[PDB]
Swiss-Prot record:
Switches off the PcM promoter thereby blocking expression of the major repressor Repc (latency factor) and favoring transcription from the early promoter (Pe) and hence viral transposition and lytic development. Negatively regulates the early promoter (Pe) thereby controlling its own expression and keeping the level of early genes expression independent of the viral genome copy number. It comes from the Viruses. Induction: Expressed in the early phase of the viral replicative cycle. Early gene transcription is repressed by viral Repc (latency) and favored by viral Ner protein (lytic development). Belongs to the ner transcriptional regulatory family. Residues 25-44 bind DNA. One of its GO terms (cellular component) is host cell cytoplasm. InterPro entries: Lambda_DNA-bd_dom_sf, Ner_HTH_dom. One of its GO terms (molecular function) is DNA binding. Signal peptide: none annotated. This is Negative regulator of transcription. The gene is ner. Gene3D superfamilies: lambda repressor-like DNA-binding domains (1.10.260.40). The keyword Repressor applies.
Length: 74
């Protein structure tokens, strides 16, 4: 019924995976300035630039945390 964690990283695979080192949507938010609400709402809101902030911490690409949303190829 609820896809919640459809194919992308669970809301917990995001924070649990990231927080596994030293990251929390609350810290990355004030580290750049955007209130904690912005970073959080960046999970379902229209703002692909918010995922860059998170993926940047893993030195990876957002296409790795949300692959089923990106499929136009490369």
């Amino acid at each position: 019924c609820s896809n919640e964690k459809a194919r992308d990283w669970h809301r917990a695979d995001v924070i649990a995976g990231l927080k596994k080192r030293k990251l929390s949507l609350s810290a990355l938010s004030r580290q750049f300035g955007y209130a904690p609400t912005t970073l959080a709402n960046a999970l379902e809101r229209h703002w692909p630039k918010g995922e860059q902030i998170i993926a940047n911490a893993l030195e990876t690409k957002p296409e790795v945390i949300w692959p089923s949303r990106y499929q136009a190829g490369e």
